[PDB]
Design a protein around this nucleic acid. Structure first.
Ligand SMILES: [Mg+2]
Ligand SMILES: [Mg+2]
Ligand SMILES: [Mg+2]
Lengths: 196, 190, 141, 108, 127, 173, 199
RNA sequence: CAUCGGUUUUGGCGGGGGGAUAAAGGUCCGGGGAACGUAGCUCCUCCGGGAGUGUUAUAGCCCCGGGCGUAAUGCCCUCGC
RNA sequence: GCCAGAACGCGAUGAUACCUCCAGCACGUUGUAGACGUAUAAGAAUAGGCUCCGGCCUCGUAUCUUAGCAGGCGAUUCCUCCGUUGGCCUUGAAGUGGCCAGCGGUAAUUCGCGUAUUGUAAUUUUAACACGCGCUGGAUCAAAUCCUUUGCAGACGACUUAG
């Protein structure tokens, strides 16, 4: 699959615009400054051409999402941007669905239901450089061992004359990307209700 | 030894239309039309004399000559299928548990589906989907008998064998548990 | 009709079939030795189409549409020559498209430097007339 | 204006050196001549001059193009490839390069 | 690549040729016989005096004043041709061109130049 | 190789006890006369006790086919040594000359039974005068009423130096 | 001979085409092979599948991320493995010879409008004896882990649909050119003058 | 580049000798045979054949001998350019 | 489905200060796995196909193009061929080709004037890309890193943050 074209709506908030810098505090914030002329000039004919391209050619359509981290009690001001695939009807329907959603907030209420089984994707908790017993759960060695107990005794036979990839070695544990599946939703609470 | 000429001939009834585009044989008759593909055998077709089709292989090594007679019977089966059709009778055999059967034509696909319940004590349901163009009926003249009809012998015979193969006993002496649906005489419709 | 089938009826290898051997000669088949070899005899007055009597492998020959009618099997030279003249095989070969194509190749190979230049000039003049005709057809279409 | 080329030579490719698998002799080169496909046709080019034309990085005698001269000595094999011998052994990096086969001294 | 008419073979492979100067611009010139192709086209020399073929086939005729005229000290100008040789070429061309023009395409054939196109195999091409 | 047929006549060298010895004629199919004489002494040693050292070659000349342009049927009797014994066989061929039939047998017997020239003895070669003398199926099918067959498939002949072709060749030549 | 040769890979045998292509690459000829999903292999498909499974079981024991054999599964890469085994690829001469070869599935542009050549020495219709079995490299690739059997199949239907429309335009031009030649008024004298010249 | 010398490679030409003084082969004159049976004739179908008789007829073929003929070709061996 | 992501695999997008970038032109190269006509698009079968529906098919041994100072200056003569600029439409498999306007050059035919002296062979220095320099016409006025900070992270780098 190849990304053919990308269409950006005008009036992007600073939460999006911070994702495109490493030093936003001292920058001139020129991101998408010359792009907004596409929406204005020629009655936005440039954007219309790109939308026609997506309908005619593309077979998979995705929207560029955006979090509102300013609404959470986190010190971070960069928003997390994401691509979400519009599964559903025809390609023409997907484009008009996504185009109408430009700059319009989307609530978790519409995406998911109360009794839906979902998959949760996140990066696990980091543990740093950890030994063999922690990474792989190998048996601990007897207390009489001279040069360390939390180790693997035999890391390979004489032949093959190499340490193999299937032998437990100390290193990094945690901070791995994981996709936990088959999680049932129990409640989709409202942020305005006082009896959530 | 290579044979310089091997030949077979096939009588064509006057009420049947036969067409061979390259080696795809299309037979059209009173009961419908059947199409068979034979592009995997090197054979030459010709018209000999007023309604007979000649089949010949020109240099065969006794492994190609063998396929010559096979093609003749397959083509002759197509002619029979569109004139007199094929009808298979299948009888139910059991000792203690009657076999309950229901047949229904799927609306979406169009193929008949045979559903077998109450095999030997079994609670599972055996669903068998017939080949296209095969009709399944439960005979009224004799109790516990299935009737499969169609123009294609391959469709009818394969469908009848699917029913028989799904009714196999497991982990039992099959010489004692002679239970299943077994194919009776293999005549024609007409 | 009753039966409607195509046709791939090859040219048969039969006593009387006229073959084209390598080099351009012709020779009828007087007797079949094997399924790969035949006995031939090209009794043609023209040296180009004349072939000595002998056995030739069928893999080195090309079958022609011309056939000598009802030639007796194993007929010797003279008897074959009488049938060759009676059937007029030499004349029929001349109008055959294979002979015209073969003759065209011989004429092109024989061209000299002056002839190749003259071929250019006469082709350019002929092309100019056809270019005028094609342009008129397209414009009037 | 003329709408034609200017080629007065047959085109050829430097195939390889004369060799016997694990030993190669740079003294003799194998040349494939475009259109030559048998020994009876390679006999025409026996003795004709062969030139390998390449480019240098320095301008000498008011040019950057340099020439190595040679000649066809004998047919090689049955498929019309010929052996050629040059003033200096022809470079090994030029295996598959293009050489000019002039119509010099002509017996026709 | 040009096409010329052979006048006389002199010695040691040296040929005296002239493709008429008014046809293709090839003056009277000596050419080694190994660097030519002898075609099958013959131009009748009926009218060209063999007396004038001599005294120019005699050597030193071409390189008589080469050493005398080799000035290369400098707006370049063409080395003017000796009026004796200009008259000599003019005399020979009169008969030669008249005979050449009697053939339908020979005049244009000589004026052109020879080149190899795609598929032209000299070992197979007849001349 | 390509075989000629020689007649070789041999004889024991005359001695005081046998002033006039017997002459032994034999027909040999050999690539050349050197082998033909070698084959003669090999066959004569086992047959008539005569050895080359105590014998002389009276003559060795080529017998040429009388009618090389008539297609005739041949029946050949041989004996050969397999890998486990010796067997007699009878084969039939359709050629122009007795030599041509013998060259066919040596290739036929090598192809089918893996026998070699050093293992085969040509007992007898005859010409079948009629068609009811033919006793084999592969030969009876070539002498039918009016033999006429096509040549299916029959890939064309293209120069092996013409590497690339512009259009796909048709196998209907 | 030519500048760049585009070879239609449909109907050719994998090994016989590879050897011919390999020698041309070493001679200095640039080659482009298209429709490598349609290449043929002699023998029953089961033997071809078993041959690839034995290939799949060979892999570096101590570290599969290094040392190969790095089993490629696309039809264009199955063929390229055949050609690479016929080249001295570990030398600078063999490395350059491989850079002259481009191998594709289907007919990508700009090769969709170039003449496609065939190699009669490798065509399976000429080589394989009738009655023998053969398979297709596309089918073998599909059942070993290739992913784009249908994507290529749909794109070729579009190409043939576009190519089909080009054919009527070619037929009309051929029909018109035949009319122009017949209706052209040409000098009678030059008619047989070219005829006796073979043209 | 021309004319030579040494070695070598690859083509072409002319003339001899030998074998059954090639065997064949073409035409003609004789004798003898048969079928994968030509004409004619007798039977069924008769679009298309089959069966029998019939030994050259309104095709031909096989074997032996003899003229043209000291024919040619082919293979091998040779003297030269 | 799931993990890594080629550190010499690729795509889309945002902003790009300067010694800048885009387009055109011009010149040049201590550049080239190696131009010299470096011309040619149906699909499919092969015990069958193509068609101008008349017929044709072993054959690319084909078709186009192919003359002129490396190709000049004029004339006679014919509306053919080529290149380029602009507009419109169209092509997403690694986006390319089609109609129309103008401009420029053109042996189908026939001629006149010039070639010489590179001296008897010496690559036929000319193409296409890539790069650099300069001119003309336009366009723009940016980031990353160090540093301080954070702890969803960490042996150190690194990573998530904020200034
Ligand atoms: Mg201790
Ligand atoms: Mg010498
Ligand atoms: Mg003789």
């Amino acid at each position: 699959l190849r990304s053919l074209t990308t269409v950006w709506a005008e009036h992007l908030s600073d939460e999006v615009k911070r994702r495109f810098y490493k030093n936003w505090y001292k920058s001139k914030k020129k991101a998408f400054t010359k792009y907004v002329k596409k929406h204005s000039d020629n009655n936005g004919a440039a954007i219309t051409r790109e939308l026609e391209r997506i309908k005619k050619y593309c077979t998979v359509v995705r929207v560029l999402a955006h979090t509102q981290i300013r609404k959470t009690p986190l010190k971070q001001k960069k928003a997390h941007l994401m691509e979400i695939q519009i599964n559903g009807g025809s390609v023409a329907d997907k484009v008009e669905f996504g185009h109408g959603l430009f700059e319009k907030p989307v609530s978790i209420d519409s995406i998911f239901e109360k009794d839906e089984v979902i998959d949760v994707i996140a990066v696990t908790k980091g543990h740093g450089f950890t030994g063999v017993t922690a990474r792989w759960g190998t048996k601990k060695l007897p207390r009489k061992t001279h040069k360390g107990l939390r180790k693997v005794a035999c890391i390979g036979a004489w032949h093959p004359s190499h340490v193999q990839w299937t032998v437990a070695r100390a290193g990094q544990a945690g901070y791995h990307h994981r996709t936990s599946v088959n999680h049932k939703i129990y409640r989709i609470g409202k942020g305005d209700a006082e009896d959530s | 030894m290579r044979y310089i000429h091997s030949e077979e001939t096939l009588e064509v009834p006057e009420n049947v239309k036969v067409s061979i585009k390259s080696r795809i044989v299309t037979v059209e008759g009173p009961r419908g039309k059947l199409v068979k593909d034979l592009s995997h055998i090197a054979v030459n077709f010709s018209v000999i004399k007023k309604g007979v089709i000649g089949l010949e292989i020109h240099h065969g090594n006794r492994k190609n000559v063998a396929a010559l007679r096979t093609v003749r019977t397959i083509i002759n089966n197509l002619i029979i299928g569109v004139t007199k059709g094929f009808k298979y009778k299948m009888r139910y055999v059991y000792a203690h548990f009657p076999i309950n059967v229901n047949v229904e034509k799927n609306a979406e696909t169009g193929n008949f589906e045979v559903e077998i319940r109450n095999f030997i004590g079994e609670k599972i349901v055996r669903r068998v989907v017939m080949q296209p163009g095969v009709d399944v009926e439960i005979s009224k003249a004799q109790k516990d008998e299935l009737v499969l009809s169609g123009n294609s012998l391959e469709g009818v015979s394969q469908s009848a064998a699917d029913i028989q193969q799904i009714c196999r006993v497991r982990n039992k002496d099959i010489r004692k548990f002679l239970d299943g649906i077994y194919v009776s005489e293999k005549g024609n419709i007409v | 009709a009753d039966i409607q089938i195509g046709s791939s009826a090859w040219r048969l290898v039969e006593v009387g079939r006229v073959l084209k051997l390598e080099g351009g000669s012709l020779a009828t088949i007087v007797e079949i030795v094997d399924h790969k070899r035949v006995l031939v005899d090209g009794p043609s007055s023209d040296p180009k189409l004349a072939a000595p009597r002998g056995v030739v492998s069928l893999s080195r020959t090309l079958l022609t549409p011309l056939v000598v009618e009802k030639l007796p099997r194993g007929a010797r030279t003279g008897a074959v020559k009488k049938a060759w003249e009676a059937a007029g095989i030499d004349a029929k070969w001349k109008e055959s498209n294979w002979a015209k194509k073969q003759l065209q190749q011989e004429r092109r190979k024989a061209l000299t430097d002056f002839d190749r230049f003259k071929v250019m000039r006469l082709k350019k003049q002929r092309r100019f007339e056809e270019r005028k005709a094609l342009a008129k057809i397209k414009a009037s279409a | 204006p003329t709408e034609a080329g200017h080629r007065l030579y047959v085109k050829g490719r430097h195939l390889s050196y004369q060799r016997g698998r694990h030993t190669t002799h740079p003294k003799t080169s194998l040349i494939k001549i475009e259109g030559v496909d048998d020994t009876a046709a390679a006999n025409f080019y026996l003795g004709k001059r062969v030139a390998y034309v390449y480019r240098g990085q320095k301008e000498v005698r008011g040019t950057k193009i340099r020439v190595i001269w040679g000649k066809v000595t004998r047919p090689h094999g049955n498929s019309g490839v010929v052996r050629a011998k040059f003033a200096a052994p022809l470079p090994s990096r030029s295996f598959g390069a293009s050489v000019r086969i002039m119509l010099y001294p002509s017996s026709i | 690549g040009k096409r010329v008419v052979l006048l006389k073979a002199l010695d040691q492979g040296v040929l005296l040729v002239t493709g008429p100067f008014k046809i293709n611009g090839v003056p009277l010139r000596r050419v080694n016989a190994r660097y030519v192709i002898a075609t099958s086209q013959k131009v009748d020399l009926a009218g060209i005096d063999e007396a004038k073929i001599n005294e120019i086939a005699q050597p030193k005729y071409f390189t008589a004043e080469k050493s005398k005229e080799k000035a290369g000290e400098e707006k370049p100008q063409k080395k003017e041709v000796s009026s004796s040789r200009v008259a000599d070429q003019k005399a020979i061309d009169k008969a030669l061109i008249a005979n050449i023009k009697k053939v339908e395409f020979l005049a244009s054939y000589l004026a052109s130049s020879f080149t190899l196109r795609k598929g032209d195999k000299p070992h197979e091409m007849k001349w | 190789g390509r075989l000629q047929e020689y007649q070789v006549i041999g004889r024991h060298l005359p001695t005081e006890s046998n002033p006039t010895p017997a002459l032994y004629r034999m027909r040999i199919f050999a690539p050349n006369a050197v082998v033909a004489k070698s084959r003669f002494w090999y066959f004569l040693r086992g047959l008539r006790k005569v050895k080359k050292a105590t014998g002389e070659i009276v003559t060795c000349n080529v017998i040429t086919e009388k009618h090389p342009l008539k297609v005739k049927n041949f029946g050949v009797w041989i004996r050969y040594d397999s890998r486990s014994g010796t067997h007699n066989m009878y084969k039939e061929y359709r050629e122009l000359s007795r030599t041509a039939a013998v060259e066919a047998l040596y290739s036929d017997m090598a192809a089918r039974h893996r026998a070699r020239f050093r293992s085969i003895h040509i007992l007898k070669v005859v010409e079948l005068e009629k068609t009811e003398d033919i006793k084999r199926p592969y030969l009876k099918q070539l002498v039918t009423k009016k033999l006429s067959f096509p040549l299916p498939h029959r890939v064309p002949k293209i120069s092996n130096k013409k590497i690339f072709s512009a259009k796909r060749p048709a196998t209907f030549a | 001979f030519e500048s760049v040769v585009v070879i239609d890979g449909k109907g050719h045998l994998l090994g016989r085409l590879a050897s011919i292509v390999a020698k041309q690459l070493l001679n200095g000829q640039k080659i482009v092979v298209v429709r490598c999903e349609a290449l043929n292999i002699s023998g029953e498909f089961f033997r071809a599948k078993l041959k690839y499974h034995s290939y799949l079981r060979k892999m570096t024991r101590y570290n599969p991320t290094r040392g190969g054999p790095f089993h490629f599964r696309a039809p264009s890469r199955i063929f390229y493995k055949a050609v690479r085994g016929m080249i001295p690829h570990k030398t600078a001469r063999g490395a350059a010879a491989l850079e002259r070869l481009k191998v594709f599935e289907g007919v990508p542009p700009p090769y969709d409008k170039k003449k496609k050549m065939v190699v009669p020495q490798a065509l399976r219709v000429l080589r394989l004896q009738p009655g023998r079995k053969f398979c297709t490299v596309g089918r073998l690739s599909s059942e070993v882990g290739w992913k784009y059997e249908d994507v290529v199949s749909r794109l070729e239907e579009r190409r043939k649909a576009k190519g089909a429309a080009y054919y009527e335009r070619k037929k009309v031009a051929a029909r018109q050119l035949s009319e122009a030649k017949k209706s052209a008024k040409v000098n009678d004298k030059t008619a047989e003058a070219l005829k006796e010249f073979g043209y």
